Amino acid sequence: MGMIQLQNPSHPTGLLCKANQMRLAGTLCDVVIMVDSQEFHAHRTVLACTSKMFEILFHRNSQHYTLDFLSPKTFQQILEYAYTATLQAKAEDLDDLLYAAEILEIEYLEEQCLKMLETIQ
Amino acid sequence: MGMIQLQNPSHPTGLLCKANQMRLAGTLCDVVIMVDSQEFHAHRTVLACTSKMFEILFHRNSQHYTLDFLSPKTFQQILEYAYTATLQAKAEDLDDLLYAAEILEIEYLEEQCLKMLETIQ
């Protein structure tokens, strides 16, 4: 037969951009991540699609999830990466980020943190 | 100061790919869209980040939302586009897709459906 196809190469990027604007306004946020005192509002789908650990964690439903293997600062860093595809940090945060990245099982961050730590080394 | 930056250009695309695999398995789906008889399980964030109409609709919380301005077939088409960035259809579906696309306010689909209808014309 005959088919028509429309493909928007910007859609993934546009969708994540809007999710990030929703997270900053609190719109449709359905999970709170608790690190030390601080609360981080976010969307389960974005965190579960970024971290295999969160996808596994949310197997057990609750409104709040407490993480204590990392600081609020490291979590914010990874939360921004999940919602924008970029992470910014200080060189002294690399060991903290690698460890969080391995536990959360976010392949890109573990691979890149390792590669940066090793070439410096 | 000194900063380190890691940017994964594949992240948007990887995140949407995983959401699509989650939708097909039913994982973390938190909304059912009802069209004629058929039920479509999906994630609120993906639909609200794709359609300004769904972002507005979900302002009013409920587990189920009924759409009757389009057929199940057209909805499936747009549901696939939302989750993959590609839509496939038959040429005879173009008027149906444009209309659904305008009501749902999915700019890319309205623009492309219009452009295809007009160049054929």
From Swiss-Prot, chains A, B:
Query: Where does the source fall among the domains of life?
Result: Eukaryota
Disulfide pattern: none
Where is each BTB domain found? 29-91
Q: What induces it?
A: By retinoic acid.
As stated in the Swiss-Prot or TrEMBL entry, residues carrying the post-translational modification Phosphoserine are: 71
- Compartments it resides in: Nucleus; Nucleus, Nuclear body
Tissue-level expression: Within the hematopoietic system, PLZF is expressed in bone marrow, early myeloid cell lines and peripheral blood mononuclear cells. Also expressed in the ovary, and at lower levels, in the kidney and lung.
Q: Which family does it belong to?
A: Belongs to the krueppel C2H2-type zinc-finger protein family.
Quaternary state and interactors:
Binds EPN1. Interacts with ZBTB32 and CUL3. Interacts with ATP7B. Interacts with transcriptional corepressor RUNX1T1 (via its N-terminus); the interaction increases the transcription repression activity of ZBTB16. Interacts (via C2H2-type zinc finger domains 1 and 2) with RNF112.
Q: What does this protein do?
A: Acts as a transcriptional repressor. Transcriptional repression may be mediated through recruitment of histone deacetylases to target promoters. May play a role in myeloid maturation and in the development and/or maintenance of other differentiated tissues. Probable substrate-recognition component of an E3 ubiquitin-protein ligase complex which mediates the ubiquitination and subsequent proteasomal degradation of target proteins.
Q: Which disease is it linked to?
A: Skeletal defects, genital hypoplasia, and impaired intellectual development: A disorder characterized by intellectual disability, craniofacial dysmorphism, microcephaly and short stature. Additional features include absence of the thumbs, hypoplasia of the radii and ulnae, additional vertebrae and ribs, retarded bone age and genital hypoplasia.
Stated name of the protein: Zinc finger and BTB domain-containing protein 16
Source species: Homo sapiens
Query: What gene name is given for the protein in this entry?
Result: ZBTB16
**Shown residues within the full chain:** 6 to 126 of 673
